[PDB]
Point group: C5
Chain length 257, copies 5
């Protein structure tokens, strides 16, 4: 009847896994104008995503009856919020002219989004500057045209790979995702204090208007997120994205479809 | 029950399918109220569309009249993901050191949408009545001192896309019996933008009598403005940045008295 | 069950039908409490109106619910009209727009709003045009039960001298929010979908004495800062829709 | 029901019926913790009153007695209107230009109130234990370093108006079984004050068991502190400003075992 | 029903009962990640206690609800005690008071709080007094399922190195809020009227194994800034009220 799965998604802020700056981007470089804009690889965050294999049910061959895992609810937590109490690790100081005070810690933009679905997250391509040339490592629509600075119904994608779809080029497509629930919050600024909450007591119902949760096609549960907590500012004023990992607990029930 | 999905692209000032689509031109500021003539492209206008619904009645004088009734909607600001871009030609956090991220989009948020069975009914109201609007804009000319506050003579309806200045027109609470409108303004120029998005939020459009907007001429009228803040260049020139809005409207065929 | 719709224009200080309607005159600041004399037009006053209801008067019109909206929020997207620039040294950027304190209050009642006199500085000399308690004394800086008024005139009771009296107003509902500061971003919402019930703990709405519906408000949105750094209050008008029913009293 | 209405004037430091009633004296700041001595009038104290309720004439020897039960209250901060004053001898926004409004009251908000059937029970706790409070103030003298956090030995009761320093005493959560208290602190020195007022908000005072405060000796105990922020003079001297608080308490006669 | 009331004092770094109890030592900042070594007393640690409940034996104590309050919020109205002044150039104005980051977390359970190790900089060398995973590797900058602990001691698990483990804690409820920055206005509320239900989705509260009730918290209120601009963590104590019932388990 009921199964719980638990999973994590580590952030993909830009710096490679299992090296000293895992969880961070490379230092951000800023172009002089829109026509000379080519953000280098490692300097911008990408979406995290994973497909969790569920116990065989939809692909069970003992019945012609179609059964699917239905995600009825979830808990999700940003993990490692504790680490942001660190104001000693090589941070620009509050009173930098006097070489005094705490580090300024992680400050600036928060972008927190997650999606839970029975198929890959469907994406709309949309960029601040269409003339940005994304690097070879990134999955983007090349030469997308001026229409990609707002909504263009031709510019679609699917979140099919971890750590390569730039956050700044792709977002959830509200014209699709009938079998996914997604949630996002953006708080801008470069000196904004991060605001994060964590608890193991908060449940999100995933049922739609008709009382139906995401249905897991091919016995796959699709988890996606981005958790930009803000910027790390070094003594030399170089700034990098810092990300945190996301916990998922999804409650599923066997459903006759 | 029929569901329609639609988008409204922002009309921040720069023309469609040119390099600054989604932005205004750089804002110039007048020395005084007497010599205040904002050039075309430097200010945002409302977005609006009439969606053609399936044609119902052969004749509007009939003993039984069918109309499409909007009973609920979902709406999302799209492209919030793009505001994670702090590399595209933005004034830097530490401009004196030529270092840090771009400051990103900051400042005023103006977010409003309306769903109705006829054009949005507007009240004309301006900061400075002596402002001279350009030929491209729809405004009340020589509105007089009274137009700085409420004057019951200064009415209009949102009959055209991309030409009614946001700073000159607002929703008329004396009218709009057949439209639901919702707005939030956060002011300032360095204010952090706060935006949320989800495919899970439904707004019921039924009034206190249990009646939704009724679509006159089988037209569904969608209106919005989504100013997310200002883009600041290295040379400190500032432009409005806007985002497109998604609408999902659930309609039922209703017999109407 | 009849519906009334009304507007109250703001009374920020500058005269009606002239170029600065909706604004105060530029704010001057005293050197000390003793010499403090805010000139007429440099401070906002309460807006009020009595709406005449259909003759009834035993029966009385009972206000059961209302909608209220701050109108013209749209105009605050104007950052071009003679405003101090974001980068004033560089002579560049948008205007800073309207910023600073927000004071939003409305009242709906069956008689004039009952007021408590209370001032920041008791030694302030208000102008002849303003309705105040003259020489109110030091007790007027906090609560003094002797210092009462009623909001009987539009555009003359200073906001900074009079507030709603919680010891009275048994036949009025009032609601207020203050956000201070001089650089604070204004935050305003508008919708035609929000209804406030005016029934009290016993299921009785304001009862309209003499078939009068009394509307009051103040809507300070913030300050307008000119290039020369002179600052004025900016206000917005308020919409009221009040649903009344005939009640046997 | 029986309704009681009362006010508590603030006790910010400056004496009643003199020109600075509602204000503290200008705040001085110690060079170090060891020599810290906040002078009388430079810091706020709690306001408190006992209201005599109608006598119930009860045999305190018998099995059944009547007590006044506080079932609900309305409370309002009064005089919020006065904070629209930016002309009264305030540091100007553009002090270098001798131009702009006064900066008005800004900085810390501390709003607390208590309603009980006996005096408010206090826990002594201070920022700096080596502070020497003046003779006029009720404190625990030489409290020791444990007074900077929780020390179960350091108790008090709020038995006098205007002499218990807000900065040395708070509500004791280990007691106060017969009192309801509510507090909010917003810190900073340039923080915008945020206050609401309405005659339409009721707070229920019944506990988990459906019992409100029971008025011992037919006495209703009201306590508050309402620091709205600081007044800053042209010469940058800063003082606390407080506002008075209104109480409306609904009481019923209760049969008590 | 039985009620427990208890307090936990903060562990901001300075030793108990000395003049700076409730504060950290002044925070020093490394030049780089490789040489990063936060000295003992300059960082906050978790507070924890085990409450020994009355012997029952089978029955177990079940925590069904709680109230919790941050105590001493009143003290933050102090702007006179050796604080950097608002107008330091004029040597005038109040103290700036406590400003900056708020980290508020509490946990109530029937066994020790289960922890996930996670650090800003894996190359930080923690002092001997602290309980950490030594040389934890680059993976410890994000989630590594190998890097686990349990909150077994008061005032030694660094806040910046351990957080509640969402993959465990089936028998504990935990709640946290972080507001960052260094000049942020602190926002704190207190009341004796707010109850939190501790029952899970099946109507079962934490069950107290070996009749032990486990309380854990951290309450960083912000930074104290001296005239000389040296900055220290300031913390506040937390009150717990836990409502318990006897439950037949076997
Ligand atoms: C709120 C207030 O008291 N405003 C004063 C105003 C200010 O005090 C002044 O602008 C600050 O420098 O001053 C006013 O004019 C004053 C004259 O009446 C007086 O004779 O001379 C004063 C200078 O010594 C000052 O010019 C004003 O600007 O209107 C009076 C107003 O009440
Ligand atoms: C909070 C506190 O300890 N306040 C002191 C105050 C401050 O220490 C002082 O303002 C910081 O400069 O000092 C007070 O007494 C002063 C003497 O300490 C000083 O030597 O002489 C001053 C007169 O020039 C002054 O009298 C004060 O300012 O009142 C005493 C207070 O407790
Ligand atoms: C977090 C950290 O690594 N702090 C180290 C600091 C800082 O590097 C310097 O104070 C910056 O100049 O230097 C020490 O000599 C010190 O002052 O005790 C050793 C300490 O371990
Ligand atoms: Mg099958
Ligand atoms: Mg669709
Ligand atoms: Mg109407
Ligand atoms: Mg107790
Ligand atoms: Mg588990």
């Amino acid at each position: 009847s009921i199964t719980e799965i638990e999973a994590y998604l580590n952030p993909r802020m830009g710096q490679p896994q299992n090296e000293d700056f895992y969880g961070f981007s490379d230092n951000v470089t800023v172009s002089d104008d829109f026509g000379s804009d080519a953000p280098p690889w490692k300097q911008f965050p990408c979406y995290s995503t994973a497909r969790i294999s569920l116990p065989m049910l939809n692909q069970d061959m003992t019945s012609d009856t179609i059964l699917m895992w239905e995600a009825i609810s979830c808990r999700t937590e940003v993990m490692g919020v504790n680490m942001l109490t660190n104001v000693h690790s090589a941070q620009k100081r509050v009173y930098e002219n006097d070489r005094e005070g705490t580090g300024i810690g992680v400050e600036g933009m928060g972008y927190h989004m997650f999606a839970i679905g029975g198929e890959p997250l469907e994406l709309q391509f949309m960029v601040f500057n269409h003339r940005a040339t994304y690097p070879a490592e990134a999955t983007v629509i090349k030469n997308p045209g001026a229409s990609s600075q707002v909504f263009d119904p031709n510019l679609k994608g699917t979140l099919t790979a971890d750590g390569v779809f730039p956050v700044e080029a792709w977002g959830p497509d509200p014209f699709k995702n009938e079998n996914t629930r997604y949630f996002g919050q953006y708080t801008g600024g470069t000196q904004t204090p991060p605001v994060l909450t964590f608890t193991n007591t908060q449940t999100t119902i995933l049922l739609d208007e008709n009382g139906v949760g995401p249905l897991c096609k091919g016995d796959g549960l699709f988890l996606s997120c981005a958790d930009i907590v803000g910027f790390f500012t070094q003594h030399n004023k170089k700034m990098s994205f810092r990300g945190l990992p996301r916990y998922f607990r999804v409650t599923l029930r066997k459903r006759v479809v």
